[PDB]
Amino acid sequence: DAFVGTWKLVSSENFDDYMKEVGVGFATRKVAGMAKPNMIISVNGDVITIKSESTFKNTEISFILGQEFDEVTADDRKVKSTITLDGGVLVHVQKWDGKSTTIKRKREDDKLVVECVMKGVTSTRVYERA
Ligand SMILES: CCCCC[C@H]1CCc2nc(C3(COC)CCCC3)c(-c3nnn[nH]3)c(-c3ccccc3)c2C1
């Protein structure tokens, strides 16, 4: 389907502001800001796996749509995550400390477009097939 593949980050807008809003400290934002991860999405039956791979940080989640799971994020938050498919978009909410953030992954033409929202801050990251 639309999401399976290896997707290399090619553009990012407002990610520093987004990380700051989430609570990431300056030193960590500095390393992240310049990073160009690959996002590797695969599916096996009911289980979707998403890996992010980069020089300074690798992460992986596996999940079933609509089933809450515990996630340790790249920035070491311990969150409760739920991912659903709504109108073709993978909508990922992370909840922690009465806070939330959403990560929406959408397929647009040749691109994987990822919108991250924390309060009034929105970051848009575009990835293209490796
Ligand atoms: C180098 C350590 C940096 C730690 C700071 C953290 C800050 C939060 C954060 N959030 C995300 C997303 C948002 O999730 C809330 C962005 C859209 C997908 C998930 C990503 C990411 N994953 N895949 N693509 N972008 C990364 C990240 C991971 C590896 C390299 C660069 C950035 C980081 C790094």
Swiss-Prot record:
* Primary site of residence: cytoplasm
Q: What is this protein called?
A: Fatty acid-binding protein, adipocyte
Q: Which domain of life is it from?
A: Eukaryota
Q: What GO terms fall under cellular component here?
A: cytoplasm; cytosol; extracellular exosome; lipid droplet; nucleus
Q: Which GO terms describe its molecular function?
A: fatty acid binding; hormone receptor binding; long-chain fatty acid binding; long-chain fatty acid transmembrane transporter activity
Q: Write down the Gene3D superfamilies for this protein, in alphabetical order.
A: 2.40.128.20
Where, by residue number, does a fatty acid bind?
R125, V126, Y127
- Say which family it is in: Belongs to the calycin superfamily. Fatty-acid binding protein (FABP) family.
UniProt xrefs under PROSITE patterns: FABP
**Underlying gene:** FABP4
Question: What is the protein's known function?
Answer: Lipid transport protein in adipocytes. Binds both long chain fatty acids and retinoic acid. Delivers long-chain fatty acids and retinoic acid to their cognate receptors in the nucleus.
CDD domains associated with the record: FABP4 (cd19467)
Q: Where is this motif: Nuclear localization signal?
A: 20-30
UniProt keyword Manganese present: no
Q: Which key words tag this protein in UniProt?
A: Acetylation, Cytoplasm, Lipid-binding, Nucleus, Phosphoprotein, Transport
Residues where Phosphotyrosine occurs?
Y18
